[PDB]
């Protein structure tokens, strides 16, 4: 199956019913609204991942004027088949001699099920118990290749001896959302000369599974090429010969071919160096050190907005895409989609998917922005100072610190969010204060409930004193 | 112009998914379609493959949610949220056999203090009357919950039955009055919508597919 | 003679922790804007299921074993329309190497062997060889079908092997999470560890409380009846008597050897109903003590009652045992001296 | 045959400081919602097993620590007359799982209990061994067999037989898993107490003192509800599979050191020695406690003795007859269905002859 020919796509339309399987023209080339369609919203940031890939290398923009004109008005069919024509070699699923993100003539004892694709289906061991079985008994075309590309990119990886993706492991992926799938692929899509000022000498621009990786090699990370990098394959992976006519088990839809396993071997290379990729965010920290974002903890998602939205040269670097849209749309609100795993090895043990909205002044006032995330983080540890005094001393006996910050979380849930999204950044003092005050008394009130069934006892309530003491002087720091 | 029928939904704990193929089981702020779904279907005697009935009534109900806070002795009780730490021993290790593992774990959220009151009503397309839904309410052939079995009801589910043009105008003969409401029906004055993953997909078992809310806000 | 089967009980636990969560912290949950002290459903019921108890007079029930050929005749005209009798009658002989009624879960399972067996003839597999892969599934319905009241009532266990989606079975009994009807003082233990070779110190913490808690918990006859394979309400009523019995002095078994609140309820109120409901409201304003929290706790039960029930509509036969001597209930609700008598009454459905 | 066995006290201090926390307070607990005086179980069980009571009637205790040098010593020196040097340290080693040098300190993981039996057992194990030049993890493979063989040996370390042990390293992981026997609670109060302070000064014999801030120790006197119960079966189990006979004899043993044994702390400096004014012994298919006789507090008349008493009884009464409950019960009071017993001894006998004598 061929990815830029066949229809694989799963949509619907943006306010219409029911699902129907597209191709890649019927998404460029028409003024039809569409918005994804599966059953989990991973594979849908995936194969949006994937779409965005593919519109990169093969139609970048010329200069923010033709970027804008064609994502007001289609292409023609023809300057589809145009721009398409010389890399449709690329994209075949089961091919002869470069099957799409695999490698072929792989040695393996056991065939493994396809649900080792799908990112906590399996891989804990609990996961027998919470889930339905069969998910991975017969995929789609593309339900397969989207899993595949999404192993490769943002799932954790199998583990012992297959590297992760050249983000890392289970990094978070930022992508502009317009208002459907065509515009929001487009708005992802970097610029002919921004592409090029985002890489700088015989620089190797195959695919993976055109020209593979010799193993054990030692990459120079500045001498991959996008189209080689975009696609990166870093598993040795081999669909096996597919079925017959029947149910995507994850899709729920029919199609002609589905894949009922594949073929995987412990594969290992290293790639020096930080690869640019342009959609995730890139924390520095010079003790230099260059990581790209991940979900580390359990905490709400307004946590991670500086990291997301906000250049800051220690300091840090938003994805390519939210900044290339930061400069030719410096007068439109953003709507960005932002998602990724929480992983023990190869468990997942938190999936996260998010859709952060903020008004117009997003671009320039970042300061703000920052100003409200760490004040958040700010009153939230001011909590967790005091209940740790309380636990501990300088003893209550007993930790109550964390169900209080889960608490606190989960009121910010409703607090936070709402400021970003509906602030006036040009004046926003008063907002803010007012976020401070309310979070203020939710951490008085949060104290007192949590160390409250100790206090009958006189022993706990000097300790208890104590620690109200550490919470009042953060607190009271906490006001300019 | 249009008969409603009015369920109240409250209890100590309940407990409403949201996306989850992990241990960790989430809970939303109210009640989920594939929640209510599965409650009216449990009133019902639906088994779990009997997927014509469980179309019927899908394609044939909709619902609107409202949230009511809880006053006593008058002072004001938000919803507050509640975390399980949850094990099983003897949990099984595969699909098919006998072996398990010794001890595994879940975190099961649930929600504290939480009161809903609900209006469904009859679709254009519908397969089933109202009163038989009424008359299952009042009668239910398998176990009601809220959510998870360990979550009875401290209220009957049935509240009432009426007819108004909104769902709005419906829920407004039933106190306590002010709530937020969530409805499937669009409401003239009101452009605000809550992005959800309720509507499940009969036709694949455990799936859920999005939808979207209506807010009418208090 | 209504479906529903309501049981509330109040206990009160002397000192002691009964249920802790990863931090070993006392397990928590906040009702009426205040905290109370729970136990969790999950852990209730293991001490029921486990207990020995339960084994005796569920584990060793009479109707606890399912033959597979008094069940050939409706079997086979409950799977006519998916497969032949050969196909069937086949399977069935593997399985075990009159009745008109079968319990669901049994028909799904038995559904997905035959498949199976069919699956296996169309490639003309060998019998021996087909036996062969499917051991382990053989072995466990085998188990299962010994177990017929066991899964009748709890549900199937966390190993089971049940395979279809009607071996997903509930269990007949649906179990509350136990909250405590106040307040709650907790006590914090400072415990240290002496080292008989050098006495000349390292304190350790467990945190404890003791606490009068509400049990609830409802039995759906009818679910009951059906997966016993069409048993009478008799006999349903005879199991929801064992439940009662359980429910009023199974106890859970953390950390009892160091704290033992060996308690049994003071208060067990049966009440029958069409809509199974709890009585949690009752404590939704949370009780103050006075002489003891068991008392006013009582009296709230029953005052809730009397304010509550008909309006919601709890009209259906009700009896109450109590040890302690507060302001009775309504005229309706009628007393019970002993618990046995309570059982009795419930045995035969309220009269 | 009646398999558990729940022992009853009620006993009342005099002003005392039988147990206290890390601020030296009186431990408490709340009940009833008002605040009893606890003596913990902990602090019971050790009162009762280094009792001189426990050394003649039922023989040496438990050696728990965590200095693997020190026990090493000790070990030497007590079966140096029956096994060789290294037989000893070998078996230390193997079920400590921590390496035997001649190093003056050796830390366990945690502090263990040791049953000196026990060890003498497995060095006999560990000697055939030896002379078979057989591997660790044989020995292990042949001593898994016979479980019983080695828990016949807690008659000469009763007290783990009745309270338990968890093992964590070593072979003692694997074989060393003993459940408890002995459930025991919190001693509590069965009355409200608001407790004492007494405020002292230690008068200097070289210096006049003038002022001075006097040290504090909080004291009060109280009337205890004990509770304990055995499982005569696990007791069984844990002996080795001894009779029905020999349970009931320990089972005695706890009974008497439950009415008659203080724990010993401040006891030189405030003499709480008194015996218990009501013990009361019933024989159950179930376990339970009469805590719930006292969840409203007793208050005082004419003391809080006797209406604890009588509340005790009040309660029996009640649940007795709610809840159906004929086994063998006998009642031994100071105080002018239970069969009632003039002395401790009748008592004792009668729960040694199964509760029909």
Known sequence: ?480 | ?218 | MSNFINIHVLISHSPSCLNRDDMNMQKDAIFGGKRRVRISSQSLKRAMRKSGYYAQNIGESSLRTIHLAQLRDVLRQKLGERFDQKIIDKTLALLSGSADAVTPWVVGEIAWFCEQVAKAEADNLDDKKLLKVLKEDIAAIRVNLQQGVDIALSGRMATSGMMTELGKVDGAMSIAHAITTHQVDSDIDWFTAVDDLQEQAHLGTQEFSSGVFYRYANINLAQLQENLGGASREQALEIATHVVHMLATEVPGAKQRTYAAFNPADMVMVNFSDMPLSMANAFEKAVKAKDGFLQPSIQAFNQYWDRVANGYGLNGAAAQFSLSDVDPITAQVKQMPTLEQLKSWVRNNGE
């Open chain 2, 1 to 218: 112009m249009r008969s409603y029928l009015i369920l109240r939904l409250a209890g100590p704990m309940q407990a409403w998914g949201q996306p989850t193929f992990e241990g960790t089981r989430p809970t939303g702020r109210f009640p989920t379609r594939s929640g209510l779904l599965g409650l009216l279907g449990a009133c019902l005697g639906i088994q779990r493959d009997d997927t014509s009935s469980l179309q019927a009534l899908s394609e044939s109900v909709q619902f609107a949610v409202r949230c009511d806070e809880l006053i006593l002795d008058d002072r004001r009780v938000s919803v507050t949220g509640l975390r399980d730490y949850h094990t099983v021993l003897g949990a099984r290790e595969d699909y098919r056999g006998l072996k398990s593992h010794e001890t595994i774990q879940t975190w099961r959220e649930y929600l504290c203090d939480a009161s809903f009151t609900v209006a469904l009503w009859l679709t254009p397309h519908a397969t089933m009357v109202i009163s038989e839904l009424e008359k299952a309410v009042l009668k239910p052939r398998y176990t009601p919950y809220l959510g998870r079995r360990s979550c009875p009801l401290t209220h009957p589910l049935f509240l009432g039955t009426c007819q108004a043009s909104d769902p709005q105008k419906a829920l407004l003969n039933y106190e306590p009055v002010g709530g937020d409401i969530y409805s499937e029906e669009s409401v003239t004055g009101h452009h605000l919508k809550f992005t959800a993953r309720d509507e499940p997909m009969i036709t694949l078992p455990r799936q859920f597919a999005s939808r979207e809310w209506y807010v009418i806000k208090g």
């Open chain 1, 1 to 480: 199956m061929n990815l830029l020919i066949d229809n694989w796509i799963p949509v619907r339309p943006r306010n219409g019913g029911k699902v129907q399987i597209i191709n890649l023209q019927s998404l460029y080339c028409s003024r039809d609204q569409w918005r994804l369609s599966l059953p989990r919203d991973d594979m849908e940031l995936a194969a949006l991942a994937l779409l965005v890939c593919i519109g990169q290398i093969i139609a970048p923009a010329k200069d923010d004027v033709e970027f804008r004109h064609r994502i007001m008005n289609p292409l023609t069919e023809d300057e589809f088949q145009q721009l398409i024509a010389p890399w449709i070699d690329m994209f075949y699923l089961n091919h002869a001699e470069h099957p799409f993100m695999q490698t072929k003539g792989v040695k393996a004892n056991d065939v493994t099920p396809m649900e080792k694709l799908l990112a906590g289906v399996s891989g804990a061991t609990n996961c027998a118990f919470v889930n339905q079985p069969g998910q991975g008994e017969a995929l789609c075309g593309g339900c397969t290749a989207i899993a595949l590309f999404n192993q490769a990119n943002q799932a954790p990886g199998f583990g012992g001896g297959f590297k992760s993706g050249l983000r890392g492991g289970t990094p978070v992926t930022t992508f502009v959302r317009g208002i459907d799938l065509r515009s929001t692929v487009l708005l992802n899509v970097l610029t002919l000369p921004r592409l090029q000022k985002q890489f700088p000498s015989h620089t190797e621009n195959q695919p993976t599974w055109i020209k593979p990786i010799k193993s054990n090699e030692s990459i120079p990370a500045s001498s991959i090429g996008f189209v080689r990098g975009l696609f990166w394959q870093p598993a040795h992976i081999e669909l096996c010969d597919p079925i017959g006519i029947g149910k995507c088990s994850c899709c729920g839809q029919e199609s002609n071919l589905r894949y009922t396993g594949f073929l995987k071997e412990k594969f290992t290379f290293t790639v020096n160096g930080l690869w640019p990729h342009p959609h995730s965010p890139c924390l520095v920290t010079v003790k230099v050190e260059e990581k790209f974002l991940a979900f580390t903890t359990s905490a709400p998602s307004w946590t991670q907005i500086s990291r997301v939205v906000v250049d800051k040269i220690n300091g840090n670097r938003v994805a390519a895409v939210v900044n290339q849209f930061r400069n030719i749309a410096p007068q439109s609100p953003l709507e960005l989609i932002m998602g990724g795993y929480r992983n023990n090895q190869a468990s997942i043990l938190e999936r996260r998917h998010d859709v952060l909205m903020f008004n117009q002044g997003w671009q320039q006032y970042g300061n703000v922005i920052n100003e409200i995330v760490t004040v958040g983080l700010g009153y939230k540890t001011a909590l967790r100072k005091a209940l740790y005094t309380f636990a501990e001393g300088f003893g209550a006996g007993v930790s109550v610190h964390e169900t209080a910050e889960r608490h606190f979380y989960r009121q910010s849930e409703l607090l936070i969010p709402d400021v970003l999204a509906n602030v006036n950044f040009s004046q926003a003092d008063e907002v803010i204060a007012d976020l401070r005050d309310k979070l203020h008394q939710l951490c008085e009130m949060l104290f007192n409930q949590s160390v409250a069934p100790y206090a009958h006892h006189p022993k706990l309530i000097s300790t208890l004193a104590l620690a109200r003491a550490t919470l009042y002087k953060h607190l009271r720091e906490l006001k300019p």
